[PDB]
Design a protein around this ligand. Structure first.
Ligand SMILES: C[N+](C)(C)[C@@H](Cc1cnc[nH]1)C(=O)O
Ligand SMILES: [Mg+2]
Length: 322
């Protein structure tokens, strides 16, 4: 099944330059950091897939169970014939929504939007084979820059699942939602997944699993830098640390140097020192309160028409309209 349309707004040389800029800025900052987008090379994407099946990492299965039991209601409320996914279309959650759109005799079109064109091609072929006659228009782009490149055809249900929105701190998060709302037409809908404030032990353990998989995922960002920028990070020298930040109500992932480290990043003509015990921030994952989700949507210009949550209150899905 080779039927496909694909627009690609991302260039290899542009991505390499973004990594250079990000690593230089993050490793020379007074408090070191690295952006989590760089976790998702081939290795890191596979580790994240594994994370979604860990006993401690409740978000994926919780969101999936909400969609499993409520997809027909979501689809009926949206009335859309086109599913736009800020994501690659590889998950069972995608099929739950497409199945419900098919069951309702609404489904015409799938628009996956993500950063890896090869994965979009694979997902497109799989979706095409499962939903014969569906139009697939894939977009390779950055969801903080190319949202205007998503086609406007049809009545669109735009979905952003998994609480990936929690990787944006409040100012960029507000800008993202405001921009997204300005690409929607009357009649379009946003389905947004948000992980919720809950027991703090359960939160920390979800990012510090017993098997060490999250720790490997986190340290792999050092392997990305090592490979792409000719650096010599010693991954064994960095401890994985997950923290609950109660002031910002967010999970944080950090890497902590066990002993002083001297790291050359040869491609940047840069050497960088870590003191013993020095920590570097690699990810934030903001957790939400239901009343604040409504307010953030409203501030972006969207009205929350529906809210779904599991019986434990662990996770929330919002449907919002212009
Ligand atoms: C895919 N998101 C960004 C939603 C995940 C990434 C992640 C999982 N374990 C550590 N980081 C999340 O924040 O829970
Ligand atoms: Mg040099």
């Amino acid at each position: 099944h080779m039927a496909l349309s694909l627009a690609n707004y991302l260039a290899a040389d542009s991505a390499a330059e973004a990594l250079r800029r990000d690593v230089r800025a993050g490793l020379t900052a007074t408090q070191k950091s690295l952006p989590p987008k760089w976790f998702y090379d081939a290795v890191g994407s596979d580790l994240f897939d594994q994370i979604t099946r860990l006993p401690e990492y409740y978000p994926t299965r919780t969101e999936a169970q909400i969609l499993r039991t409520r997809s027909a209601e979501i689809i009926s409320a949206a009335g859309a014939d086109t599913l736009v996914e800020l994501g690659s279309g590889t998950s069972e959650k995608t099929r739950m929504l497409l199945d419900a759109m098919r069951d309702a005799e609404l489904l015409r079109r799938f628009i996956p939007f993500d950063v890896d064109a090869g994965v979009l091609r694979s997902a497109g072929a799989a979706i095409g084979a499962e939903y014969p006659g569906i139009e697939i228009d894939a977009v390779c782009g950055d969801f903080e820059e190319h949202l205007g490149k998503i086609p406007h055809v049809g009545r669109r249900l735009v979905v952003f699942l998994g609480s990936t929105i929690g990787n944006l701190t409040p100012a960029p998060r507000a800008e993202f939602l405001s921009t997204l709302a300005d690409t929607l037409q009357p009649g379009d809908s946003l389905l947004l997944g948000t992980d919720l404030v809950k027991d703090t032990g359960r939160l920390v353990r979800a990012y510090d699993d017993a098997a060490g998989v999250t720790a490997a995922f986190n340290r792999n960002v050092l392997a990305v830098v090592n490979r792409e920028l000719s650096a010599d990070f010693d991954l064994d020298a960095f401890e994985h640390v997950a923290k609950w930040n109660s002031d910002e109500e967010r999970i944080e992932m950090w890497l902590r140097a066990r002993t002083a480290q001297h790291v050359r990043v040869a491609a940047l003509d840069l050497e960088v020192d870590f003191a013993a015990g020095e920590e570097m921030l690699t990810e934030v994952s903001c957790k939400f309160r239901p009343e604040n989700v409504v307010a953030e949507l409203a501030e972006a210009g969207l009205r929350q028409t529906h809210w779904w949550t599991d019986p434990a209150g662990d996770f929330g899905l919002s449907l919002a309209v212009r």
